[PDB]
């Protein structure tokens, strides 16, 4: 949550068949947002996690509580 | 006695099929016989008990008591009556589980289909 409050990062658990490309686009397409980069990692339980930085125009935090969570 | 060839009087197989039997089959095993009253009425002896049905425990300790079948607990092979219950030490209450075969039907919840069942066993209805 601090990534979102501090970093402008949207953390998503993501499909393991998906790459940085497919993640970036299918975020762009699903939330109407512009993305900087997509650092990812495989959680120790078998789920890809996505660190996702939006560009300076979007305040991820505002996005976060407009998608639903907070 | 079993004069057929596709029926078994073997005690093992019997008790398996009882206990393992699926829900759809259980409905039929959980039958109650109609009341002397309801019997001359629909011209019919027994019937697969169902929910919003009315009943008289004509056996057991709960003899005489009567009510609406709250739920049929196929899983537990037992029926529950809304009105016949246990008040625990902590005063909270809990359902007793009556067996269909020890009940008697008093008023039949009726359906298009309940009707058809009754009509099919050679019954009649008022």
């Amino acid at each position: 949550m601090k990534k979102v409050e501090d970093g402008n990062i949207l953390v998503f658990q993501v499909s393991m068949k998906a790459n940085k490309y497919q993640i970036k686009k299918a975020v762009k397409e699903l939330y109407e947002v512009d993305v900087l980069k997509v650092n990812t990692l495989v959680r120790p339980n078998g789920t890809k996690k996505a660190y996702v930085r939006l560009t300076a125009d979007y305040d991820a935090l505002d996005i976060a509580n407009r998608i639903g969570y907070i | 006695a079993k004069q057929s060839l596709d029926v078994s009087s073997d005690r093992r197989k019997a008790r398996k099929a009882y206990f393992t039997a699926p829900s759809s089959q259980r409905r039929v095993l959980l039958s109650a016989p109609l009341s002397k009253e309801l019997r001359a009425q629909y011209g019919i002896k027994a019937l697969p008990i169902r929910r919003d049905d009315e009943v008289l425990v004509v056996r057991g300790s709960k003899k005489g008591q009567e009510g609406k079948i709250s739920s049929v607990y196929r899983l537990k092979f037992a029926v529950q009556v809304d009105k016949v219950t246990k008040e625990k030490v902590n005063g909270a209450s809990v359902p007793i589980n009556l067996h269909p075969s020890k009940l008697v039907i008093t008023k039949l919840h009726l359906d298009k289909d309940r009707k058809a069942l009754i009509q099919r066993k050679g019954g009649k209805l008022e």
Binding site: - | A1, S9, D10, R11
Partner: protein
Amino acid sequence: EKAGHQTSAESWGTGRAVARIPRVGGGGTGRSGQGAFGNMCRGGRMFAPTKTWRKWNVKVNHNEKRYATASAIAATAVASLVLARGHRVEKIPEIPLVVSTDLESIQKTKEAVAALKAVGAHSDLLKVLKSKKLRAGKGKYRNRRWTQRRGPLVVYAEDNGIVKALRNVPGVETANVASLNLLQLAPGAHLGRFVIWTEAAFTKLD
């Protein structure tokens, strides 16, 4: 047959301070180390294990079978025996019991029953029934589960629905003269059934 033996146990030989039945090998599992094959080890094979090719059935001399069944028949007269052998005949007309041939044709249990009663059966049918008991053994759960005394055996000549009338009544067995079964003529090798013969039947004997 393959049982006792689904192991791999070799002995351990002498000298390891322990007895020398073969022993399960390997490790990590309790079973590991224990006795095999031994007719005295747990999970052994059993000594001289039963076979299918036992002599089950017996060849009896065809002619004795007769002399037997015959003898069996002669005693179902003989008052004393029929009496001695169970069978409340304490007070039936005459031995042998000969009923009408009309019996052979009676077609409803309920009918037959009270016919048989009139002929004197009653006390005997009642003697069964008063006697269904739970098989003492384990046939109690090998579908040999109940048990009860033997009733009258009604021999007929032509079956015109008698057998299906008397089927459901407990103790009463039926038989056409042309057969006649030594297992029913002296059940348990005890001489003197309670036989009730239709006349047409009776007359077929010679």
